[PDB]
């Protein structure tokens, strides 16, 4: 409705920044869109595509998820909540995927990127799925710079919603791999103040957050409302000042506006 549009515009203005939203409602195959064709820095939300690329590779390499990866001091980057506990040992690719998706561990992301061949290989996987908007240019930590006007490491809300629908509810991945991705996302620990904070307590959410420079604050989610068909929701937000603080409340507010009713 035009009312949902006016409410999102008012939220954006009060926030001082730039807000991007795409909701897909699978009940009626409808969309609610706000700046949904503009580019936004993905930050952490790009870990979904890296983990999905590893899952796809595993469809023709059984025991790929059990392959061991060495963790060294030289691997540490700027946010390593899980990897810092495993220095000088190994972690499996399954453990790295869970750490990336559920804790936003940046060493884990870098190991998923490296395994599949680098940022251009993650990007080529996106293209294979039919996503011609996503671009992963850099590794962690530099992919989080989020400089206004910079197209590196960006996508649009419309494209990321359509791709997340394919990955979690569609047929991009085999049944075992799709179920594993959904299980990992439902176990996320970083999203309770973002999209989830704008939805009723009874609804079930699998999500991946991101944050970066310029106060960039992001979340992408698959949502099972009580007794309703699933939803896909992307909320991306960025601000004008390099050192702006995070605004997870803006993502919660956007989620409430687009799901009310
Ligand atoms: Cl500043």
Helices 47-58 and 119-128 cross at an angle (nearest 10°) of 70
Q: How far is the CA of 8 from the centre of ligand 1 (A)?
A: 25
Q: How far is the CA of 146 from the centre of ligand 1 (A)?
A: 13
Pairing of strands 90-92, 216-224: unpaired
* 35: alpha, beta or left? (left if phi > 0; alpha if psi -120 to 50): left
Structural biology method used:
X-ray
Which residues are found with C-beta within 5 Å of the ion, ligand 1? Answer: 241-243
Q: How far is the CA of 259 from the centre of ligand 1 (A)?
A: 33
What is the Cα–Cα distance from 90 to 253, expressed in whole angstroms? 41
Q: How far is the CA of 233 from the centre of ligand 1 (A)?
A: 29
DSSP string, 11-58: HHHHHTSEEEEEEEETTTTEEEEESTTS-EE-GGGGHHHHHHHHHHHH
Q: How far is the CA of 244 from the centre of ligand 1 (A)?
A: 6
Backbone torsions φ then ψ of 220, nearest 5 degrees = -130, 135
> Out of 3.40.710.10, 3.10.300.10, 3.40.30.10, 3.40.50.2020, which CATH number does the structure's domain 2-260 have?
3.40.710.10
Q: Which residues contact 210 (CB under 8 A, 6 or more apart)?
A: 42, 43, 44, 45, 46, 104, 144, 216, 217, 218, 219
Domain ranges of the chain: 2-260
3-state secondary structure of 150: coil
Exposure string for 152-166, b = 16+ CB within 10 A, e = fewer: bbbbbbbbbbbbbbb
What is the Cα–Cα distance from 54 to 127, expressed in whole angstroms? 15
């Amino acid at each position: 409705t035009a009312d949902v549009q006016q409410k999102l515009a008012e939220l954006e203005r009060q926030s001082g920044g730039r807000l991007g939203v795409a909701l897909i409602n699978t009940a009626d195959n409808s969309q609610i869109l706000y700046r949904a064709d503009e580019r936004f820095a993905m930050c952490x939300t790009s870990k979904v595509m890296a983990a999905a690329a590893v899952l796809k590779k595993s469809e023709s390499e059984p025991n790929l998820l059990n392959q061991r990866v060495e963790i060294k001091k030289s691997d540490l980057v700027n946010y390593n909540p899980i990897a810092e506990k495993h220095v000088n040992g190994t972690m499996s690719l399954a453990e790295l995927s869970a750490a990336a998706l559920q804790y936003s561990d940046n060493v884990a992301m870098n190991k998923l990127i490296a395994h599949v061949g680098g940022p251009a290989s993650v990007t080529a996987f996106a293209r294979q799925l039919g996503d011609e908007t996503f671009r992963l240019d850099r590794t962690q930590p530099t992919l989080n710079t989020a400089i206004p006007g910079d197209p590196r490491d960006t996508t649009s809300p419309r494209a990321m919603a359509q791709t997340l629908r394919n990955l979690t509810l569609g047929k991009a991945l085999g049944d075992s791999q799709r179920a594993q991705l959904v299980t990992w996302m439902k176990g996320n620990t970083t999203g309770a103040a973002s999209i989830q904070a704008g939805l009723p307590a009874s609804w079930v959410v699998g999500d991946k957050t991101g944050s970066g420079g310029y106060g960039t604050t992001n979340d992408i989610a698959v949502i099972w409302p009580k007794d309703r068909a699933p939803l896909i929701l992307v909320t991306y937000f960025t601000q004008p000042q390099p050192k702006a603080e995070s605004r997870r409340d803006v993502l919660a507010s956007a989620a409430k506006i687009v799901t009310d009713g």
